Write a protein that binds this ligand. Structure first.
Ligand SMILES: NC(=O)C1=CN([C@@H]2O[C@H](COP(=O)(O)OP(=O)(O)OC[C@H]3O[C@@H](n4cnc5c(N)ncnc54)[C@H](OP(=O)(O)O)[C@@H]3O)[C@@H](O)[C@H]2O)C=CC1
Ligand SMILES: CCCCCCCCCCCC(=O)SCCNC(=O)CCNC(=O)[C@H](O)C(C)(C)COP(=O)(O)O
Ligand code: SF4
Ligand SMILES: [Zn+2]
Lengths: 157, 62, 51, 110, 185, 332, 149, 145, 385
């Protein structure tokens, strides 16, 4: 196993580098947090520097950012959007309304967070999160991706 | 350090010596950055504990 | 099953400014403790409507 | 079309109730066609379910209340017929010793 | 064109038995009619030359669960050329049909539906009166003082069937109602 | 087996029950129903997973803020397995693959691991209940390969813990089953549905939520569950032919078959696909031609007429015609 | 005496007197005012059955109820005496009385000082003069009562 | 003995089957005053553990023992009381007594000599609730001789 | 006429907008927007929180003109309380409302242009909007949602080094506006994609309640801050741009001129800034100074009873109205006399603008509907409350 370990480690490193160097988040903006989320990608912070080009449809995007409150009527639409994405499906809960209840958290027509649906990998807190906070959340997601031994697990099994 | 709980950490601070009969405690040296001013009448044989700060005051002599 | 009553004046304070008002008291006595943070949970929507 | 004025008397509301039941029965193939349910249920006992729900509230005498139930039923019917309600909800709504000992064993508050 | 002139004019010009009561104050001029002479009152206030009230700002709604006529819908108006505001309001009921004013001001078509949605006061000769704000399968009227804040149904995703299904409400931490009310006021 | 329920409030997602059950191998097909059933009644469930950290990801939606807490465990290692149980009182076993990799042979797929967890639960001293799960029809004398080792495991587990319940589902049917979905996928590709059994192979398919209800009911009821071994079975007896018609009528396609005898299929299935003998560990998985299954379809899988039944706990099986089988619309 | 229980969540925090001119007259006793602590201390939570070997384990509601239903008929129709409690409400005592009487037995009595007392006229065991009516009296003849403890 | 309560105090030490019972802050029952005034109780707080109302417990025990009772709800048992003491279901009524010491079983029997004896010794420890409290335990140590 | 389902799940059409519509193949007949996907439920939640706790609700509504939204609530509470606010607070409130107007106009213009397709001025204008969000960061705690304005005055005093930065920004903001305008007004494509689109007559605007830019894009000189001036606006000198034709191009020109006038008003407010206190003093609805509540008894009592109970507004009801960047924003407060509002309806200017979309897209192209959505500047926080 040690003889064929360098190759699998290199393959894992290459896949992790490829997946971290090009993440295509899907702008699923819903509320005021979408303003800060499109404002991160402006000329001052240049979200595109990290290969974070946005996508218009969930078919090509491999990540999605839930920016804004999630009411009851939009919950099925969010679930359908999440289902259509390809296999990886990394999800980021931007804002304080999306990552668990929120400032409302009590009204009749509000889902108490986007964790009742669409299981989340990174929680970005703030109302609204600063552009640097969203950048830090994306960096944390990239760090999360680097821990995936995709080939080693499939080769050990 | 963090092994000592604050309750067991304030007790080791030596009590303050006051010449007068009442001493006003304001928290920090700057009045605006501490607790509201508290006048404590220290007359017993035991130190008078500031209810906000936890600081103790002992009267030495008039 | 509800109870219609006028809340009494609190003993600790001598003012009678909260009197003369009637309330419906839904008996929402079902509350428990969340076993992670000690928060009080409810399953009855009328927990504080009448209050 | 536009919302009719409230019925003056009960006999004028009764024909409105019959018209609403008539429309519900007329539109009943559409629900079975657009929601893809054929083996789970047959259209005949949906008639029984609608009749039961319309006869349960048969003791109301006030014409205004009856008119309001007709209004709300029309809104629910239009929600179901149009692509507003979502699957597995229509079928959710539609289609021993003693009770006291069971209620005692399950909980204090019954 | 100011508060007092309009008060005099609408006290003289308006036919009686229309305005049940009226007020004049700095907060706003009110014309409380009797839930039947509403279309007539608005039509007169819209077409008359000395009161050219053209734009309907909004259609409010207040739930008083202590009076016989539980609800009270409020019509906010505005005269652009006279630069003045008139606030006409009625008294409604939970089972009663109050007349609609979509014919005069077409903008009312959506506040009409919103008032139906929030409170439950139905309207006559209105093209749609469909729910506009709440969920499609929503039940009850939320802005009523009866409706609990948390609501009656929760929403969550269950894996046994790949869809989002509603369920009875069950909250982790209840809404803490702080009773700050004190006497001497 | 009493004094471990500890009910707190109404039946809900955030309610409380005194169950800290750890469901081993819950990342598969039965696990996503068993965990959901456990979490629906407020029981806290722990999911020890060994694959990627994104495999037990859909299971976080079952509970509510800490009901589902997966941990990583190494099957080869032993004392790290104790970590995912040191704070538990109920242990459920679902491990076992229909495949065969070199690293985990048939014996070390659902027998060695089951014995290890049974022994470490016995020496734990706190594991109140145990529900091991095997397949229906497992026996020492059977042409089926894994079923023999599975039966050996299910008889060896009782020695370590006599008060252990054994469940025997039979060809579970669900949205992600391995016996009906592959047939539909193959039909979509080109479509002939090779019947290895050639029909006349009547068994008892069951729907997965009924099985999960069976385990959760065996946990709920206080009495004849420890030691007893149930045999969960469907409402009626189904063969591979009429099952083929009841799946074809929903795909909306002409029912065509290439029904063939046993030995040609067995020769094209086992030796052709058996190549886990040298160099690499991962090999492509069998779709329909399974080494164990080809031998398993030579005998009926009827529920024992004298052992425990599925209605012993008062559960009516789901009638497998119109309600359970509804995922096939995605194919039509 | 009328009280006003104040509770935060599932536990009682404090007890505050409620005004009732006839019964307590806006005051409240120490025993009834600071007894809210006992409602959260050692309390019976689940049914418990003594074992054969002297151990005392906890079971479900059905099991203990099944045991008591087994032993209910192991005794003669006589000698099924059931003693009511000091705090038990009227409904509990009524149902206990009905249950005992419907099994050929009558030995139900209130806890303490109920040996041979007859209570049939509703004035030989009640405060016939109202509590508020004691303000019109001119002399008291307390007979072994000590209305302070 | 089949004990049924919400505390211990020397009855648990002898009990054979223990059935938990609700407290007075978590049940709705009618209590009678010394002057014959009756009044109900409001369920302030939830019950602790798997405990049920006393009347529910005895009704279920009656059913399981095999003897039938004609009531199954808290309203029904109240109607049963109406035939045994209809003043017990008149909450806000200041009913006086309609008799006197005239009619009674006049029985001049033998006298006694033993003096009257105190029936309560410690005021702060009377019922189980006050016996298990901590405030009362330290209160009945410095407030009395 | 077949029906297709719009409703994209991205902010590239402002998000949260179903908009089912009728199609003849190339010309839309009736468009039915399905609002309610963002009905968070503020109006029900207002009644459960005191007059101070309810202020942050108003920042969330129409979440691009933040301080222009809580300003209406503050004015309504002041009117219900007969509270007099000092002059310096009025001037800084006007300044920050003008900053909100500039932010809203920039965001609306660039979002609409990016909907059309022009994507380069978008990033230029967000580069310029950085400088004003930084100003918001300075005075208050947060960049976007700033609870700066309170019923009494403003929450905290301005920092020392703020006016210099604001004037330095205003020195070049006009040139930045010229740069953004030269790319669109003089362009050819912009004219053919906007002129004679979504024309509304003055009678139609009045009937459908289009107070704001839509009303002023039809020739109606109805400016609420000039017709009914609330804060110190009579002292300030500015012009009200009024369009001639109700097409989308004149609305764009009106918005550009509104940005110009807002810059002028900011300059005037910077010049004419008096000294004095910021919070009111007549009534007790303002917190005591934190250097004062720590040595005074009455001040500490006021702090306690204000940060727990809040001020009790005497029982009355009124409808205030301010000139939000979108249009007329009004708050209908009903006071029970207690410390919580009985009923607080929020008149969102975008609600009427969104309902009036059906007749605006009458016999237009389908891609001609996104430009109509952009030109009316709809955010769905206010539309669904
Ligand atoms: N439900 C059915 O249709 C039938 C069920 N059964 C029995 O029920 C059991 C569960 O059914 P099913 O849910 O289909 O099984 P799974 O499909 O869930 O596979 C079991 C899981 O256990 C884990 N696992 C497998 N081998 C090992 C190993 N060597 N070490 C550690 N973890 C391992 C895998 O998780 P990962 O892949 O993430 O490692 C796998 O997903 C089966 O094992 C079988 O014995 C019997 C007949 C049919
Ligand atoms: C799939 C379809 C979707 C919609 C399904 C329907 C959903 C809403 C159903 C409506 C719910 C209601 O209660 S709305 C209808 C309720 N209204 C009434 O029941 C009228 C009162 N009853 C009478 O008038 C008479 O008794 C009568 C029984 C009519 C006959 O007896 P006669 O001849 O002597 O008059
Ligand atoms: S977190 Fe704050 S800014 Fe974001 S959607 Fe929620 S309330 Fe709006
Ligand atoms: Zn101090």
């Amino acid at each position: 196993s040690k003889a064929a370990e360098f190759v699998i480690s290199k393959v894992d490193d290459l896949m992790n580098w490829a997946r971290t160097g090009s993440i295509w988040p899907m702008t699923f903006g819903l509320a005021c947090c979408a303003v800060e989320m499109m404002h991160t990608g402006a000329a001052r912070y240049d979200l595109d520097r990290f290969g974070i080009i946005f996508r218009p449809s969930p078919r090509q995007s491999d990540c999605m950012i839930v920016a804004g409150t999630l009411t009851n009527k939009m919950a099925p639409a969010l679930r359908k959007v999440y289902d259509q994405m390809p296999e990886p499906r990394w999800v980021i809960s931007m804002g304080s309304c999306a990552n668990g209840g929120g400032y409302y958290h009590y009204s009749y027509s509000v889902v108490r967070g986007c964790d009742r649906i669409v299981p989340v990998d990174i929680y970005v807190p703030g109302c609204p999160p600063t552009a640097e906070a969203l950048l830090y959340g994306l960096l944390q997601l990239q760090k999360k991706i680097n821990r995936r031994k995709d080939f080693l697990h499939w080769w050990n099994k | 350090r963090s092994k000592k709980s604050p309750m067991e950490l304030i007790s080791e601070v030596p009590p303050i010596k006051v010449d007068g009969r009442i001493v006003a405690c304001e928290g920090d040296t700057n009045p605006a950055l501490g607790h509201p001013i508290e006048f404590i009448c220290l007359d017993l044989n035991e130190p008078a504990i500031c209810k906000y700060c936890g600081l103790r005051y002992v009267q030495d002599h008039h | 099953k509800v109870i219609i009553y006028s809340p009494a004046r609190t003993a600790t304070q001598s003012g009678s400014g909260k009197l003369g008002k009637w309330k419906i008291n839904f008996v929402s006595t079902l509350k428990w403790e969340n076993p992670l943070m000690g928060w009080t949970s409810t399953g009855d929507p009328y927990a504080n409507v009448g209050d | 079309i536009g919302v009719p004025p409230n019925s003056a008397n009960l006999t004028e509301a009764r024909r409105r109730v019959f018209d609403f039941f008539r429309a519900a029965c007329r539109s009943i193939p559409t629900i079975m066609d657009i929601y893809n349910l054929q083996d789970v249920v047959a259209p005949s006992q949906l008639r029984y379910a609608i009749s039961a729900q319309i006869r349960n509230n048969a003791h109301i005498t006030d014409p205004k209340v009856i008119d309001l139930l007709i209004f709300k039923g029309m809104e629910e019917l239009t929600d179901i017929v149009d692509h507003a309600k979502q699957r597995h909800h229509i079928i959710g709504q539609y289609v021993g010793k003693t009770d006291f000992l069971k209620n005692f064993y399950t909980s204090n508050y019954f | 064109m100011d508060n007092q002139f309009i008060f005099k004019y609408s006290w003289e010009t308006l036919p009686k038995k229309w305005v049940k009561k009226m007020e004049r104050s700095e907060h706003g001029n009110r014309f409380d009619t009797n839930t039947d002479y509403l279309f007539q009152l608005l039509c007169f206030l819209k077409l008359h030359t000395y009161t050219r009230v053209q734009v309907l700002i909004d259609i409010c709604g207040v739930d008083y669960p202590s009076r016989k006529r539980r609800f009270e819908v409020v019509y906010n108006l505005l005269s652009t050329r006279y630069n003045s505001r008139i606030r006409v309001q009625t008294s409604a009921d939970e089972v009663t049909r109050i007349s609609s004013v979509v014919s005069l001001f077409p903008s009312a078509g959506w506040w009409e539906r919103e008032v139906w949605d929030m409170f439950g006061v139905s309207f006559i000769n209105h093209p749609d009166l469909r729910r506009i704000l709440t969920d499609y399968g929503f039940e009850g009227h939320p802005l009523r003082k009866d409706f609990p804040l948390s609501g009656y149904v929760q929403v969550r995703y269950d894996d046994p069937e790949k869809r989002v299904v509603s369920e009875p409400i069950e909250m982790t931490q209840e809404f803490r109602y702080f009773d700050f009310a004190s006497p001497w006021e | 087996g009493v004094g471990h329920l500890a009910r707190k409030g109404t039946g809900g997602r955030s309610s409380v029950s005194g169950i800290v059950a750890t469901v081993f191998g819950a990342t598969g097909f039965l696990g996503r129903y068993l965990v959901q059933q456990l979490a629906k009644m407020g029981s806290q469930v722990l999911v020890p997973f060994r694959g990627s950290e994104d495999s037990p990801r859909h299971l976080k939606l079952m509970g509510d803020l800490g009901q589902v807490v997966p941990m990583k465990f190494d099957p080869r290692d032993e004392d790290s397995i104790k970590a995912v149980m040191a704070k538990a009182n109920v242990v459920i076993n679902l491990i076992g693959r229909e495949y065969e990799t070199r690293n985990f042979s048939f014996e070390d797929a659902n027998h060695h691991i089951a014995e290890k967890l049974a022994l470490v639960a016995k020496e734990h001293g706190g594991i109140m209940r145990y529900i091991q799960v095997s397949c229906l029809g497992a026996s020492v004398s059977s042409p089926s390969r894994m079923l023999r080792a599975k039966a050996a495991a299910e008889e060896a587990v009782l020695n370590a813990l006599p008060e252990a319940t054994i469940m025997r589902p039979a060809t579970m049917i669900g949205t992600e089953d391995r016996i009906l979905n592959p047939w539909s996928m193959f039909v979509k590709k080109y479509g002939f549905l090779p019947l290895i059994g050639g029909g006349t192979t009547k068994f008892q398919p069951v729907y997965v939520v009924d099985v999960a209800a069976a385990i959760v009911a065996a946990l709920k009821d206080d009495g004849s569950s420890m030691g007893k071994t149930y045999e969960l079975g469907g409402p009626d007896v189904f063969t591979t032919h009429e099952l083929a018609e009841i799946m074809y009528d929903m795909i909306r396609e002409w029912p065509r078959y290439v029904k063939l005898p046993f030995p040609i299929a067995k020769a094209m299935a086992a030796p052709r696909d058996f190549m886990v003998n040298k160099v690499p560990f991962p090999l492509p998985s069998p779709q329909i031609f399974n080494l164990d299954q080809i031998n398993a379809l030579t005998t009926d899988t009827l529920v024992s007429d004298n052992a425990l039944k599925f209605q012993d706990l008062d559960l009516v099986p789901h009638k497998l015609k119109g309600y359970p089988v509804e995922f096939l619309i995605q194919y039509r | 005496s009328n009280i006003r229980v104040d509770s935060r969540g599932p536990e009682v925090m404090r007890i505050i007197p409620r005004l009732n001119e006839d019964i307590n007259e806006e005051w409240i006793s120490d025993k009834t005012r600071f007894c809210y602590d006992g409602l959260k201390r050692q309390r019976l939570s689940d049914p418990m059955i003594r074992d054969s070997d002297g151990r005392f384990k906890a079971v479900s509601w059905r099991d203990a109820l099944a045991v008591v239903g087994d032993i209910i008929h192991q005794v003669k129709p006589d000698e099924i005496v059931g003693v009511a409690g000091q705090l038990s409400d009227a409904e509990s005592m009524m149902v206990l009385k009905d249950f005992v009487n419907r099994m050929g037995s009558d030995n139900v009595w209130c806890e303490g000082t109920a040996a041979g007392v007859d209570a049939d006229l509703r004035y030989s065991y009640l405060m016939n003069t109202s509590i508020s009516g004691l303000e019109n009296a001119d002399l008291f003849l307390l007979i072994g009562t000590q209305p302070r403890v | 003995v089949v004990y049924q309560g919400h505390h211990g105090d020397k009855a648990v030490y002898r009990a054979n089957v223990i059935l938990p019972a609700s407290a007075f802050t978590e049940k709705e029952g009618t209590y009678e005053n010394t002057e014959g005034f009756t009044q109900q109780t409001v369920p302030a707080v939830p019950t602790v553990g798997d405990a049920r109302d006393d009347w529910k417990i005895v009704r279920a025990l009656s059913e399981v023992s095999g003897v039938k009772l004609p009531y199954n709800s808290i309203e029904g048992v109240r109607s049963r009381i109406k035939s045994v003491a209809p003043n017990l279901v008149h909450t806000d009524e200041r009913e006086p007594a309609a008799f006197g010491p005239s009619l009674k079983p006049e029985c001049k029997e033998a006298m006694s000599t033993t003096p009257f004896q105190t029936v309560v010794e410690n005021f702060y420890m009377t019922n189980s609730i006050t016996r298990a409290s901590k405030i009362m335990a330290q209160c009945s140590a410095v407030l009395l001789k | 006429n077949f029906t297709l389902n719009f409703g994209p799940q991205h902010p590239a059409a402002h998000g949260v907008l179903r908009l089912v519509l009728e199609m003849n193949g190339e010309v839309v007949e009736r468009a039915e927007p399905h609002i309610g996907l963002l009905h968070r439920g503020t109006e029900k939640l207002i009644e459960y929180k005191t007059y101070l706790q309810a202020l942050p609700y108003f920042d969330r509504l129409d979440y691009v003109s933040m301080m222009a939204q809580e300003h209406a609530y503050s004015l309504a509470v002041e009117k219900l309380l007969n509270c007099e606010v000092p002059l310096r607070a009025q001037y800084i409130r006007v300044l920050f409302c003008e900053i909100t107007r500039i932010l809203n106009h920039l965001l609306a213009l660039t979002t609409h242009a990016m909907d059309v397709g022009a994507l380069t001025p978008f990033l230029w204008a967000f580069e310029e909007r950085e400088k004003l969000l930084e100003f918001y960061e300075r005075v208050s705690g947060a960049r976007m949602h700033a609870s700066f304005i309170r019923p009494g005055g403003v929450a905290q005093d301005l920092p020392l080094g703020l006016c210099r930065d604001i004037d330095s920004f205003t020195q070049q903001f006009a040139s930045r506006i010229d740069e953004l305008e030269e790319m669109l007004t003089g362009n050819r494509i912009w004219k053919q994609r906007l002129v004679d689109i979504g024309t509304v007559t003055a009678q139609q605007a009045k009937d459908w309640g289009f107070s704001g830019v839509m009303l002023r894009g039809s020739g109606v000189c109805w400016d609420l801050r000039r017709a009914a001036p609330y804060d110190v606006y009579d002292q300030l000198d500015f012009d009200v741009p009024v369009g001639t034709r109700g097409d989308c191009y004149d609305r764009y020109c009106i918005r550009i001129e509104e940005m110009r006038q807002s810059l002028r008003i900011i300059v005037q407010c910077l010049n004419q800034m008096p000294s004095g206190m910021i919070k009111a003093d007549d009534r007790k609805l303002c917190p005591p100074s934190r250097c004062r509540m720590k040595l005074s008894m009455e001040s500490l009592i006021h702090h306690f009873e204000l940060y727990t109970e809040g001020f009790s507004v005497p029982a009355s009801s009124t409808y205030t109205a301010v000139e939000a960047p979108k249009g007329e924003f009004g708050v209908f407060l009903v006071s029970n006399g207690s410390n919580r509002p009985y009923r607080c309806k929020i008149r969102a200017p975008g609600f009427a603008h969104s309902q009036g979309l059906d007749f605006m897209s009458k016999h237009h192209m389908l891609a001609d509907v996104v430009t109509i959505i952009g030109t009316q500047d709809i955010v769905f926080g206010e539309v669904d409350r």
